[PDB]
Amino acid sequence: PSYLKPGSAVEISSDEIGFRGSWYMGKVITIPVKCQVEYTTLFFDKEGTKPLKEVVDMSQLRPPAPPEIEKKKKIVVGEEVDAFYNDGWWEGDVTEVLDDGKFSVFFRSSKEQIRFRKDELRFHREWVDGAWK
Template identity: 30%
Template sequence: MDLYKVGMRVEVVGHSDGFWNSYYGAKVLRVDRTKLRVRYDQIVDEDYGEYTVEDVDLKHIRPYPPESFDINYRLTVGDDVEVYDRDGWWRGEVVFDELDDELMVYFSYMAGDDEEEFGTFPYDDVRIHQEVKQVGKGFEWSHVKVAGPK
């Protein structure tokens, strides 16, 4: 359990209807055996006007991902990405990158919902999707699907 520490930045993985494939930044306030108490970076409790504090099961937590594997990498069609929107990061796939400073992203899990399946986002709001696994007393990150450097 010494993987997570008080003060550490983490992401809470969306785990309820309408929030699948999303990640929300938070700071660890307390560590228990199976849960972490976190304070979200962006989600505000409307009743109190403060950032929401919640106890979250460890299976819905991941450490905050590294900023980038390669700062020279340019996102392109086919890349598995996360887009910052509505206070969190939402997983999608780049489907068009010929716009000036924006990428068009497809969200397959929204197909058939009332939500938009496609969106156009500035490069600054898009990051490569990375998966994490525990390795010893630390974490190892890897890309899921990357089309290749441009």
């Protein structure tokens, strides 16, 4: 797997409860099936002296989400997005498009309902067998 090389940028996912629907940013540290990653945004300590490292499943990893027609495109009610929240990307569904150009996003998993600015949203992508979508 080309992207899984030590030093490579990856988005990390969890099967763990409370982390349903999130991609956090990170890099590979070692590959042996499980491998070791270092989060970019999470730390062991509240003081940020020690980047969080974990052993996860390759199933759980993926390349950095693909990157100007893409970002200028409008967001619609019903579009699947990731919202940047708690320092990672969480998938929810756009429930409302607001007058000031903000958006209300429903998170099916946590029953949360949160408003965001466009700069806080990216289009949701899926990574399937080496391909995006």
